[PDB]
Design a protein around this nucleic acid. Structure first.
Ligand SMILES: [Mg+2]
Ligand SMILES: [Mg+2]
Ligand SMILES: [Mg+2]
Ligand SMILES: [Mg+2]
Ligand SMILES: [Mg+2]
Ligand SMILES: [Mg+2]
Ligand SMILES: [Mg+2]
Ligand SMILES: [Mg+2]
Ligand SMILES: [Mg+2]
Ligand SMILES: [Mg+2]
Ligand SMILES: [Mg+2]
Ligand SMILES: [Mg+2]
Ligand SMILES: [Mg+2]
Ligand SMILES: [Mg+2]
Ligand SMILES: [Mg+2]
Ligand SMILES: [Mg+2]
Ligand SMILES: [Mg+2]
Ligand SMILES: [Mg+2]
Ligand SMILES: [Mg+2]
Ligand SMILES: [Mg+2]
Ligand SMILES: [Mg+2]
Ligand SMILES: [Mg+2]
Ligand SMILES: [Mg+2]
Ligand SMILES: [Mg+2]
Ligand SMILES: [Mg+2]
Ligand SMILES: [Mg+2]
Ligand SMILES: [Mg+2]
Ligand SMILES: [Mg+2]
Ligand SMILES: [Mg+2]
Ligand SMILES: [Mg+2]
Ligand SMILES: [Mg+2]
Ligand SMILES: [Mg+2]
Ligand SMILES: [Mg+2]
Ligand SMILES: [Mg+2]
Ligand SMILES: [Mg+2]
Ligand SMILES: [Mg+2]
Ligand SMILES: [Mg+2]
Ligand SMILES: [Mg+2]
Ligand SMILES: [Mg+2]
Ligand SMILES: [Mg+2]
Ligand SMILES: [Mg+2]
Ligand SMILES: [Mg+2]
Ligand SMILES: [Mg+2]
Ligand SMILES: [Mg+2]
Ligand SMILES: [Mg+2]
Ligand SMILES: [Mg+2]
Ligand SMILES: [Mg+2]
Ligand SMILES: [Mg+2]
Ligand SMILES: [Mg+2]
Ligand SMILES: [Mg+2]
Ligand SMILES: [Mg+2]
Ligand SMILES: [Mg+2]
Ligand SMILES: [Mg+2]
Ligand SMILES: [Mg+2]
Ligand SMILES: [Mg+2]
Ligand SMILES: [Mg+2]
Ligand SMILES: [Mg+2]
Ligand SMILES: [Mg+2]
Ligand SMILES: [Mg+2]
Ligand SMILES: [Mg+2]
Ligand SMILES: [Mg+2]
Ligand SMILES: [Mg+2]
Ligand SMILES: [Mg+2]
Ligand SMILES: [Mg+2]
Ligand SMILES: [Mg+2]
Ligand SMILES: [Mg+2]
Ligand SMILES: [Mg+2]
Ligand SMILES: [Mg+2]
Ligand SMILES: [Mg+2]
Ligand SMILES: [Mg+2]
Ligand SMILES: [Mg+2]
Ligand SMILES: [Mg+2]
Ligand SMILES: [Mg+2]
Ligand SMILES: [Mg+2]
Ligand SMILES: [Mg+2]
Ligand SMILES: [Mg+2]
Lengths: 205, 146, 64, 118
RNA sequence: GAAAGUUAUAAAUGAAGCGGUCUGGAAAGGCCCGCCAAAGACGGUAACAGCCCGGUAGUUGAAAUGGCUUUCCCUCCAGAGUGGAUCCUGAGUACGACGGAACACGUGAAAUUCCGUCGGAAUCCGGGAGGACCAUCUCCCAAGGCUAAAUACUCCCUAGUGACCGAUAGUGAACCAGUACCGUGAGGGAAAGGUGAAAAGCACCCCGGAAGGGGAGUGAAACAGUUCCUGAAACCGUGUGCCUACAAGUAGUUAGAGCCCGUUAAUGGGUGAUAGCGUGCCUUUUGUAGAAUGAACCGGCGAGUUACGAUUUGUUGCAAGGUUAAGCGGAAAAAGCGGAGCCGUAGCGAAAGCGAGUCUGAAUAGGGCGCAUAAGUAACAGGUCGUAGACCCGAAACCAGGUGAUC
RNA sequence: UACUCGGGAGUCAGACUGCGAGUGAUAAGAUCCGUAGUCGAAAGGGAAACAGCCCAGACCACCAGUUAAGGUCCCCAAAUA
RNA sequence: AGGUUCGUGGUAGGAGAGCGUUCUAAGGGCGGUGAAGUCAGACCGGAAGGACUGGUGGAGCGCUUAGAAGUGAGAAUGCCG
């Protein structure tokens, strides 16, 4: 609802007002769990396959006479109990992705994006720009505002070289203000969001 | 959310039951199937309607009727949903579709006389029941058929 | 694949307003000289499927 | 993902074999035979915990009887005297006196005779 | 037929620690200091490396050949209006009879399309269809031909990915594998990975014909010595503490003396003279120690799964409403858009139809079904069912294409 | 305890003993019914051994006590009452 | 959370609570001062099971909370060695 606006160099820049219906609702923990699993279950390729008893090479011929030989009755040398025989059930190529009703996928983003505010783990910034791509200059900026951990830079527009001079750093990820999602926000500890990106998050919901 | 502390809603997820894994689980040797039947074999059982030879029920009662090809079915609106309109306006089928009362227009709009109306309204539609017509006439409204 | 309706049952069963099934009496074709009329008046009406039969044939007509 | 069996089958089977230490022949070496012996030993041990209580009580009775006959009595006619006189010492303690401290056993037997007469 | 640009087929350049100290055979590891980053992808190096090597991001590069895209060149070109006497608009065809087939449609009331045999129109005032057929009306010109894109597949090449396998697994084949072997032939078809960082792969002495050993030496390790990382079990041996040659034994368990030891230290360990009780495991059965069935022993492998639907219970979102499908967008994402559609909100009747009622009935009667007495829907998870090999192994047999009279 | 609605099954080869009948020869550990018990799916104690007979229903431990059927000369606990 | 009463044999079968295995995500860890594996012990829990110490081995592996399954073998005149 009310937060302190910070300049790029780390000083103060005034104060900002966040909408209460977006950053101030009571979180629904039992919903955020479901949405995280649904998005994580939909990221797996599911490319796995084995060979049945009808796909292994060979077979067909009955190994030996049904009766009188003294051995056990057998029908093919690729039966499941044989050595080089085929698998019984095993895996198979298969999709895992599923979605959730739209009114729930919008409540989860409100809950996860408001849970940070309750934990004082959100930093609103006046404007974050770099004239030239320089990873040295970016890491110093993370020293102006005490981060020392995984972050998530959300920038809306401009941002000439923000996306470049943060790739090499490990725990830092930059998303252009429409890609914000439940899984990414929950995955990263802190949340750095510029002033111009708050409106775009606000207006979509 | 602290992905290291996920806890789903209680009762929303249960555990698969796997049969044929020893006799301590109660579903071991025979796996809930009994002993030596047709139902105890792989891909066993009989058809959905089969009765073991006795004549099935559907084959000892007669067929009945036919299906009309020119069947007309009307979209139904009662009188209670007609109290959401301020008195004076002219209610028309093209107005009723937008306000969510009628999703699809099947073959026409028909007003039935369930409930009661208290606001003087003028309506237009394709059909009226006998009791519905008088109800909106006794409210000072007028009845017109498109 | 979606499971198929039993067309034979769909031609002689009727679904009522409470989910039950309505049928027709089945002794009404060609021996009306051997039936008293009290026995013929009752047979031209319509009955209901019993709970034992419904418990067996409920899936043959599900999207009817 | 495949789950190949390993380090789990032999861990359970080796535990059963070690429980069959000291058995004759293959009963201490082979899993199939040793499993049947370990199961059978438990079934025996379960029902000798019942017989052990019966076996000892028959031992104490036979020792009270032998000591009581030296005083012109018998077990049946001695144990009646004690109850009729109010002494509640059980068989385990009574047999202990008859072997170690026979002097006190006679004092108890004298009270038994008094109860029988009066 | 030329000119220009782009791409594919070799490549070039490319930042930053030999930092100090400890263990160590060896530092990439621990502790203390620094630095680069449009470069913290991956692999190698004597153990885990952004700063040691090949490299990576970025920026460059084509003699020659192929591809694509533009331009030039080259090549080829009549379309509007009115009248409209007269002329033309696909003949053994369009239909029809008989016999078959394809149409979801099994000759049925059977339209529509095709094939074989016979018969056989009109041609602009004309002809065909709208599920037999006639009249009216509406739509359209068969019996000549061509046509890109949106769709199906992967023997291959380039760059990559995986809550896929890891030597009985994954292709039959990680190894000179369709090989060895079997068959006259068609055809069937295996087993088999690991020294060490580096061969430094054991100068030399002794036993022996040799093999093989014992020292010596290399190595961190030779109990790593040319099936060589690790090396379980069955199986075969050597030595030793306790018991055993008057005893009738599903081989144990309970009581127990003697002898010998000394633990994850606690009413401890090994063996046990003698005494009581005691007819293995599974399957199938009214009933099995069973003289009913299976197993020589050890080890690995070996059986209720998945997709799409139906129903019911639990949880979550919204609620007289609920919800999108295909598709556009994008990173094999997340939003946003997409309301076509589906379920519910009204039922009764074969149907016209009527409607909180309706149907039977001559009936305001009675009775059947319904409201009164009203919660659904989307998603996930569990139980069960249907279609699929559907819980795993097992026939004798049937059909289709081929190989065989060297017996 | 009943009853109603809903989800999930298994079973349809039974055996013997007492009583009432049929077939049989007023035979069968025979066969077929009705009625009660036990076994099936039940260990423990007694009938020498002996699923169905008699007593009686095992949650675990105890080197504690009282009883049931059946027994008290020795094997073998208790009366040479 | 604590009491009172009544119970706790069990085949086919129904319901519930759990152990262990491989992999994935996050947190937090140990390991050449010796990981997994393997051998031996007289330890711990109600069971499936879990630690500790010592030898061999010579480089990877646990713990916590969720998720997904090629998920646990003593028997098939089972296949291979
Ligand atoms: Mg085949
Ligand atoms: Mg074949
Ligand atoms: Mg294979
Ligand atoms: Mg369970
Ligand atoms: Mg059971
Ligand atoms: Mg079994
Ligand atoms: Mg069976
Ligand atoms: Mg059955
Ligand atoms: Mg109807
Ligand atoms: Mg009739
Ligand atoms: Mg694996
Ligand atoms: Mg196994
Ligand atoms: Mg012994
Ligand atoms: Mg270079
Ligand atoms: Mg360089
Ligand atoms: Mg050193
Ligand atoms: Mg160093
Ligand atoms: Mg690396
Ligand atoms: Mg090493
Ligand atoms: Mg290495
Ligand atoms: Mg025609
Ligand atoms: Mg014809
Ligand atoms: Mg015409
Ligand atoms: Mg018509
Ligand atoms: Mg039509
Ligand atoms: Mg044409
Ligand atoms: Mg192989
Ligand atoms: Mg191996
Ligand atoms: Mg040859
Ligand atoms: Mg090597
Ligand atoms: Mg030598
Ligand atoms: Mg020599
Ligand atoms: Mg030599
Ligand atoms: Mg040497
Ligand atoms: Mg040396
Ligand atoms: Mg070594
Ligand atoms: Mg070493
Ligand atoms: Mg090695
Ligand atoms: Mg070796
Ligand atoms: Mg060994
Ligand atoms: Mg002797
Ligand atoms: Mg010790
Ligand atoms: Mg003995
Ligand atoms: Mg029999
Ligand atoms: Mg058999
Ligand atoms: Mg045999
Ligand atoms: Mg085996
Ligand atoms: Mg909508
Ligand atoms: Mg009624
Ligand atoms: Mg099934
Ligand atoms: Mg020939
Ligand atoms: Mg029921
Ligand atoms: Mg019957
Ligand atoms: Mg019967
Ligand atoms: Mg009977
Ligand atoms: Mg008899
Ligand atoms: Mg009999
Ligand atoms: Mg009989
Ligand atoms: Mg009973
Ligand atoms: Mg039985
Ligand atoms: Mg008994
Ligand atoms: Mg008995
Ligand atoms: Mg007898
Ligand atoms: Mg006995
Ligand atoms: Mg009991
Ligand atoms: Mg007594
Ligand atoms: Mg005696
Ligand atoms: Mg029980
Ligand atoms: Mg169950
Ligand atoms: Mg870790
Ligand atoms: Mg492992
Ligand atoms: Mg170890
Ligand atoms: Mg564990
Ligand atoms: Mg483990
Ligand atoms: Mg398995
Ligand atoms: Mg063999």
């Amino acid at each position: 609802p009310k937060l302190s606006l910070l300049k790029q160099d780390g000083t103060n820049a005034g104060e900002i007002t966040l909408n209460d219906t977006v950053f101030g609702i009571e979180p629904n923990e039992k919903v955020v769990v479901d949405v995280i699993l649904s998005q994580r279950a939909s990221l797996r390729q599911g490319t796995h396959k084995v060979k049945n008893r009808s796909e292994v090479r060979g077979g067909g011929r009955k190994p030996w006479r049904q009766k009188g030989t003294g051995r056990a009755r057998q029908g093919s040398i690729r039966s499941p109990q044989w050595r080089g025989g085929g698998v019984v059930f095993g895996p198979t190529p298969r999709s895992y992705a599923y979605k959730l009703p739209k009114k729930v996928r919008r409540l989860a983003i409100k809950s996860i994006l408001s849970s940070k505010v309750n934990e004082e783990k959100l930093v609103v910034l006046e404007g974050l720009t770099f004239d030239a791509p320089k990873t040295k200059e970016f890491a110093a900026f993370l020293k102006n505002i005490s981060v020392d951990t995984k972050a998530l830079i959300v920038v809306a527009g401009e941002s000439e070289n923000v996306e470049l001079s943060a790739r090499n750093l490990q725990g830092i990820t930059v998303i252009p203000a429409e890609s914000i999602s439940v899984l990414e926000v929950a995955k990263h500890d802190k949340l750095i969001i510029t002033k111009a990106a708050v409106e775009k998050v606000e207006e979509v919901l | 959310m602290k992905l290291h502390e996920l806890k789903p809603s209680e009762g929303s997820r249960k555990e698969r039951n796997r049969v044929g894994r020893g006799t301590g689980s109660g579903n071991g040797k025979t796996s809930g199937r009994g002993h030596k039947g047709q139902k105890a074999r792989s891909g066993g059982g009989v058809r959905l309607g089969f009765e073991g030879g006795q004549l099935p029920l559907f084959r000892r009662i007669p067929k009945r009727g036919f299906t009309n090809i020119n069947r007309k079915e009307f979209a139904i609106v009662n009188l209670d949903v007609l109290n959401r309109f301020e008195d004076g306006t002219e209610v028309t089928p093209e107005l009723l579709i937008e306000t969510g009362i009628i999703r699809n227009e099947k073959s026409g709009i028909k007003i039935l006389s369930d409930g009661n109306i208290e606001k003087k309204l003028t309506v237009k539609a394709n059909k009226f029941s006998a009791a519905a017509k008088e109800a909106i006439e006794a409210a000072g409204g007028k009845t017109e058929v498109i | 694949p979606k499971m198929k309706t039993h067309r034979g049952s769909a031609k002689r069963f009727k679904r009522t307003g409470s989910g039950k099934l309505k049928r027709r009496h089945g002794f009404t074709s060609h021996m009306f000289a051997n039936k008293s009329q009290k026995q013929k008046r009752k047979l031209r009406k319509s009955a209901m499927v019993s709970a034992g039969d419904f418990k067996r044939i409920r899936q043959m007509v599900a999207k009817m | 993902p495949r789950v190949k069996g390993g380090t789990v089958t032999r861990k359970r089977r080796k535990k059963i074999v070690k429980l069959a230490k000291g058995y004759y022949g293959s009963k201490h070496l082979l899993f199939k035979v040793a499993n049947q012996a370990v199961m059978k030993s438990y079934q025996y041990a379960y029902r000798d915990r019942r017989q052990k209580k019966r076996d000892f009580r028959r031992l104490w009775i036979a020792r009270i009887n032998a000591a009581a006959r030296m005083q012109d009595l018998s077990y049946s006619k001695l144990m009646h005297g004690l109850k009729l006189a109010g002494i509640d010492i059980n068989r385990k303690m009574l047999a202990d006196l008859a072997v170690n401290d026979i002097a006190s056993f006679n004092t108890l037997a004298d009270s038994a005779k008094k109860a029988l007469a009066k």
